[PDB]
Amino acid sequence: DGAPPIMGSSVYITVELAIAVLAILGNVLVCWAVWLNSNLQNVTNYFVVSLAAADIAVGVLAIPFAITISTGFCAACHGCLFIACFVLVLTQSKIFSLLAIAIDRYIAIRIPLRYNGLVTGTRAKGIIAICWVLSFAIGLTPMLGWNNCGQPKEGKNHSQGCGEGQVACLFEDVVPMNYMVYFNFFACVLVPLLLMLGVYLRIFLAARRQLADLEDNWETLNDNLKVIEKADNAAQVKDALTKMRAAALDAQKEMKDFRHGFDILVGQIDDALKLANEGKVKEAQAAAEQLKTTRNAYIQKYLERARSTLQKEVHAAKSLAIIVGLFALCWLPLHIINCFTFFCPDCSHAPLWLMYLAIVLSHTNSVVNPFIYAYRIREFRQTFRKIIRS
């Protein structure tokens, strides 16, 4: 007395095909953009490309697999396992790519001087290839023996008339829910997501601390100038100049144009320090006044450029954090439903329509990343226009 299953099946299959088309087109555009623009050919975008390659595979393979397993067709149980678990391989690869992007950005903001020598393209390719191997091993673990193939639903397999060694290919009949909850969700998805949260929190903490240190050195420069102009004793000028020389060397610790600026600044401070040690107070004050011209024509240019670079790193890290957040938004509902199915056997199973709504939502994650790049990364957006208009 239920509606014919092909009616709801047609809606589900049509929606899945719409998602596969959008996932392929958008992520092919991302890969094409990185190929054409050398400004997008950095190590960070090598993981973005691996991220896009997995989403392309979601539309090409994982979504046709999901359509197949929804029919419950008779199949050899290990072949049904591969059909059911291959999306876990792709998803695990994206988790590894997302974690590497956060680590790459944390390295770029914590030690930017050592970044290009530490994070190279060759090492990135090796990391990516290793993570794909681990993704296959993690996602296909049920094929190694952790499955319900040894406990088949004989009622379903007889009613559908499956042959010997065959089962009705249904996800929750062949894939153990304890694998899905403890192994896949808790260990392989939830824990890495929490690690990404901690890395991005450390990224924003590092940026906030460095931006405050730039303003601290800047105000230390201007406040000690007022101390010298209103000083009366020679030691007052000397103590204020010693603290400027520390804040000057600690601020540097066309790139030589900024190095030449601190050379003038420290040189003038040493000039005023020599006069202050001699007892000359008026001549030491006038020498310290020369620091203002160096501050305007040099030191202020470094502050605003160093501040601009840090603000770009904050904005870029926020964009990459949105991608992690949308990943969790798309996949957590399916994981949470499996937790209810596993941990509350007295709860009624989530209805059929909610199951496939959660499945469809997890697939839409393969569509959203190209939109994040187009809206939040100007280099991607301008390359997208160039590809499309020509």
Ligand SMILES: CC(C)CCC[C@@H](C)[C@H]1CC[C@H]2[C@@H]3CC=C4C[C@@H](O)CC[C@]4(C)[C@H]3CC[C@]12C
């Ligand atoms: C390079 C790409 C495009 C190749 C695609 C490979 C896919 C389409 C192939 C490889 C292994 C194949 C599975 C191997 C096991 C059999 C078991 C059988 O009872 C039903 C079909 C099933 C489940 C096959 C489904 C399709 C399958 C998953």
Ligand SMILES: CC(C)CCC[C@@H](C)[C@H]1CC[C@H]2[C@@H]3CC=C4C[C@@H](O)CC[C@]4(C)[C@H]3CC[C@]12C
């Ligand atoms: C992570 C963000 C998007 C929030 C996730 C909300 C979803 C995953 C939660 C909120 C309410 C939850 C439902 C509340 C009612 C129960 C009834 C029980 O018999 C089956 C599970 C079911 C149906 C839960 C399924 C998962 C659920 C729908």
Ligand SMILES: CC(C)CCC[C@@H](C)[C@H]1CC[C@H]2[C@@H]3CC=C4C[C@@H](O)CC[C@]4(C)[C@H]3CC[C@]12C
């Ligand atoms: C990403 C953050 C939010 C952590 C992930 C949320 C998960 C771990 C939490 C949120 C809601 C929790 C569920 C809330 C309802 C209870 C019902 C109980 O009978 C079994 C445990 C169960 C089903 C919990 C299982 C674990 C659970 C699904």
Ligand SMILES: CCCCCCCC/C=C/CCCCCCCC(=O)OC[C@H](O)CO
């Ligand atoms: C089975 C599911 C869980 C398994 C998880 C525990 C496995 C233990 C450690 C494995 C080492 C990593 C193996 C992957 C490396 C593949 C080789 C490769 O390609 O490495 C190229 C590298 O750039 C230069 O060799």
Ligand SMILES: CCCCCCCC/C=C\CCCCCCCC(=O)O
């Ligand atoms: C670029 C290629 C992308 C994939 C092309 C193939 C498109 C076909 C999509 C899914 C087909 C699913 C077949 C359904 C299996 C039905 C099982 C049964 O007969 O009982």
Ligand SMILES: CCCCCCCC/C=C\CCCCCCCC(=O)O
């Ligand atoms: C198989 C060996 C794994 C260790 C090498 C891989 C490097 C770390 C990989 C991910 C672990 C989680 C990292 C958590 C934050 C690390 C960033 C940091 O502390 O600087």
Ligand SMILES: CCCCCCCC/C=C\CCCCCCCC(=O)O
């Ligand atoms: C530049 C780097 C490009 C990386 C391409 C991706 C390579 C992925 C290769 C296939 C790994 C499959 C082998 C895993 C075996 C264990 C899975 C299993 O059979 O259980």
